Design a protein around this ligand. Structure first.
Ligand code: HEM
Ligand code: HEM
Ligand code: HEM
Ligand code: HEM
Lengths: 146, 125, 140, 137, 145, 127
């Protein structure tokens, strides 16, 4: 993972405009709706039977907060992502056994959410910077697989 | 088809307030919720808004750090927390809704529905 | 395999593309080439610079093929037969690239048509794009 | 999308399974469980030891479903509808697992039916198994 | 990585493999079973039909090199990332081979081994080989992750 | 029409010497046959020497010849070769080429073969 001015700075710019609490719930909710097999990892979260149910679920909303909080922290260590996520990699790979393709799907869902709310402002060059980040994050989470 | 605003009233300079807007008649999850205000003799004038659900924030610079937005998706209600109010904040604050209004465009975006607005008057007398 | 509700979601959402076909197809391509530069290796003689007329032309052709697929969503293998031979036989397009273009299309629809990108429609469009990709990566 | 030649290849090759359906299905599952232990999380109440009756019974069910799919290769979504809801809705099987079982099925056919596993038939079987997996997800 | 009884089973079966010929068969089968992989080999000539692929002499020759590297991996199972450092740069930084294709080639090789060894290629033997080809694919993708 | 397995090479050698046998195959799709070598001494049973699966992809040697004999194939010539090194008096025999369609490695030592050559005499002796 390596960025540049208007890339490292462009990511930081748009993220300062994101409510870290709420964006996590939207991105996780959409992951569970668009890729329903991921619901298997969260059966204890209650009603995930409907799109409306998913997005209103307080456990999804709450767990999204934590997911994106770690993502936000990843933005403060863009040059040391494998180290920042080393323990979470152990949890997801060694205990939960989440297939790493799901890490890629969640980053791309987050990118779709950012595009939804920002419209034209989420330009191809801005998306390109964010694609670098979510690929770096997905890779660091999969590190205990490599 | 109702937008009922609550909160606001009279406050002392330096004080704070929480405004709320009760929404009805639409699928709340699909509307961008925003807050406008117009001071007496002054034009109608943007304060703060959020993308649907509050995922991203964008406030006029005169209110940034000062006002903060809400989400209560289960109650179809959004709230506006106003801190460090100054008797220069006096105006009628209007709740407004536009279906799928994207960020940055909240300041210059056609709205579909408007409430009564609720009086917020800051003064020392 | 698309459900009846998926077909309803995609027709309603994509039918709102309308006159933006070329622009949306071009932007999805520009997004893909920028976010995933390896995809440019499939267009070795194209002018791929920002705003390229050649990319606009190809973007309309891609967007027009999706409109056709939506109109014939119950018979995609027949309606996409020539394109399937082009991509699978002629071009030997690695399947991973269809996932990249599909993602950039979703991003383009989400940025331009927010009202159409609800979670449920998001899910249907993704499946539709995956079904198209499965067909275009097939040899029959 | 299967070609006409794919369908002929699959029908010819799979038709040689015949009465070995259970044995081949059980072996493909045992191969998957050993080579890819994460797949075992979908069978939490099974005895997964070698030769377990539960694996034998289930292996027969899987192979018999493929015979049916081969017989309905022109309308597999219809012929596998109940199986689609079981795997996609009830069981929530991550799609990556179908690639593992499909691979272990090819391995079993190659070991047992060497004369049938030519490069072109190999390719058709792979596409057939991927088509079945697409439907069931 | 590999238990003593896995390393012993792997080495035993590999002593029975003609590394030259197995490589041509597996690479040929990769190009037939997943035809998009032919795009990486434009310069190898006629790959227009399964018969053409399986008879292609550049495929046969390049297969020998691929399987020679697998054989080299079997002698350095605890440092595959280091043994494959040059091939990783080539496949990832120069050729831009999607890493899923590394997995496919490893699995095609497993299919060839099962094809020729039959009953001897037991579930436990295959499982040891799946660990090896997964290690090789991961070492090949290392410049990606 | 007829399937032929023609053995050549072989003759006389001194103990410790080497010899190369070849078996030219015709009349079947060579790429699909496992090629094997058996031998029979006068009065004795026929016995496996070495074989490979179709195309020469995998090999199988009797323990008495492993490392000592090497089998190879030339798919372009539809011919298989058996290089015999370190020959001993116990190696004297008639050596038979044999072909079996899609016969897998473990079954090469016993697995039924479809076609058998005439065999060619190999004589190891110090006299
Ligand atoms: C790709 C970026 C991801 C990030 C940054 C992330 C972040 C996190 C973090 C920080 C935790 C710790 C929660 C705790 O300790 O309670 C967690 C837990 C968890 N993660 Fe993820 N995650 C990611 C992807 C995924 C995916 C794709 C899945 C499955 C589809 C998943 C499944 C889980 C589960 C099941 C838990 C346990 C939740 C619980 O029961 O409390 N994660 N995640
Ligand atoms: C939804 C997915 C796709 C659709 C609907 C689509 C559609 C089309 C169409 C309509 C054409 C015009 C063919 C003609 O004029 O005969 C075309 C050509 C082409 N496509 Fe795609 N395509 C898709 C995915 C991809 C991807 C992912 C790639 C590579 C990453 C790709 C590479 C090409 C190339 C190289 C050409 C030929 C361009 C030229 O030489 O003029 N396609 N495609
Ligand atoms: C070609 C691929 C597959 C086929 C044809 C297939 C077929 C079947 C069949 C016929 C059944 C039994 C239905 C019944 O008893 O009424 C079943 C159930 C089941 N399958 Fe699959 N399946 C496939 C892939 C998979 C995969 C990849 C997994 C997980 C890795 C999986 C996990 C299960 C489980 C957990 C059950 C429930 C077993 C039980 O309740 O006893 N299947 N499948
Ligand atoms: C997974 C295990 C693999 C191994 C161990 C391997 C090994 C090798 C080796 C030893 C070379 C020769 C490089 C040289 O002589 O300098 C090579 C080159 C190459 N490999 Fe791979 N490879 C693997 C997978 C793949 C895959 C999956 C693809 C594409 C689908 C691929 C595409 C290529 C290409 C295009 C070349 C250059 C050939 C040429 O034009 O001369 N490899 N690889």
């Amino acid at each position: 993972v390596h960025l540049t001015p208007e890339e490292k700075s462009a990511v930081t710019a748009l993220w300062g405009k994101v409510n870290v609490d709420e964006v996590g719930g939207e991105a996780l909710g959409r992951l569970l709706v668009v890729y329903p097999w991921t619901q298997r990892f969260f059966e204890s979260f209650g009603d995930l039977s409907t799109p409306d149910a998913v997005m209103g679920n307080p456990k999804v909303k709450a767990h999204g907060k934590k997911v994106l909080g770690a993502f936000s922290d990843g933005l403060a260590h863009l040059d040391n992502l494998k180290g920042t996520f080393a323990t979470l990699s152990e949890l997801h790979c060694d205990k939960l056994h989440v297939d790493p393709e799901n890490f890629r799907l969640l980053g791309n869902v987050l990118v779709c959410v950012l595009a939804h709310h920002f419209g034209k402002e989420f330009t191809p060059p801005v998306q390109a910077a964010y694609q670098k980040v979510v690929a770096g994050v997905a890779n660091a989470l999969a590190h205990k697989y490599h | 088809v109702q937008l009922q605003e609550s909160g606001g009233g009279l406050v002392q300079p330096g004080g704070s307030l929480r405004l709320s807007c009760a929404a009805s008649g639409f699928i709340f999850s699909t509307y961008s919720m925003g807050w406008f205000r117009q001071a007496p003799g002054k034009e109608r004038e943007f304060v703060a808004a959020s993308t649907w659900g509050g995922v991203t924030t964008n406030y006029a610079d005169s209110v940034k750090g000062r006002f903060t937005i809400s989400t209560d998706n289960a109650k179809n209600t959004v709230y506006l927390q106003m801190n460090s109010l100054n008797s220069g904040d006096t105006a009628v604050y209007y709740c407004a809704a536009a279906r799928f209004l994207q960020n940055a465009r909240l300041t210059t975006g056609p709205y579909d529905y408007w409430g009564q607005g609720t009086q917020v008057t800051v003064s020392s007398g | 395999v698309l459900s009846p509700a998926d077909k309803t979601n995609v027709k309603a959402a994509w039918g709102k593309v309308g006159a933006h076909a070329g622009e949306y197809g071009a932007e999805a391509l520009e997004r893909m080439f920028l976010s995933f530069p390896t995809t440019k290796t499939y267009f070795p003689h194209f002018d791929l610079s920002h705003g390229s007329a050649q990319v606009k032309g190809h973007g309309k052709k891609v967007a027009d093929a999706l409109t056709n697929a939506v109109a014939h969503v119950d018979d995609m293998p027949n309606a996409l037969s020539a394109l399937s031979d082009l991509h699978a036989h002629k071009l030997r397009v690695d399947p991973v690239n269809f996932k990249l273009l599909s993602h950039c299309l979703l991003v383009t629809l989400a940025a331009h048509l927010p009202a159409e990108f609800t979670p449920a429609v998001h899910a249907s469009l993704d499946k539709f794009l995956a079904s198209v990709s499965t067909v275009l990566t097939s040899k029959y």
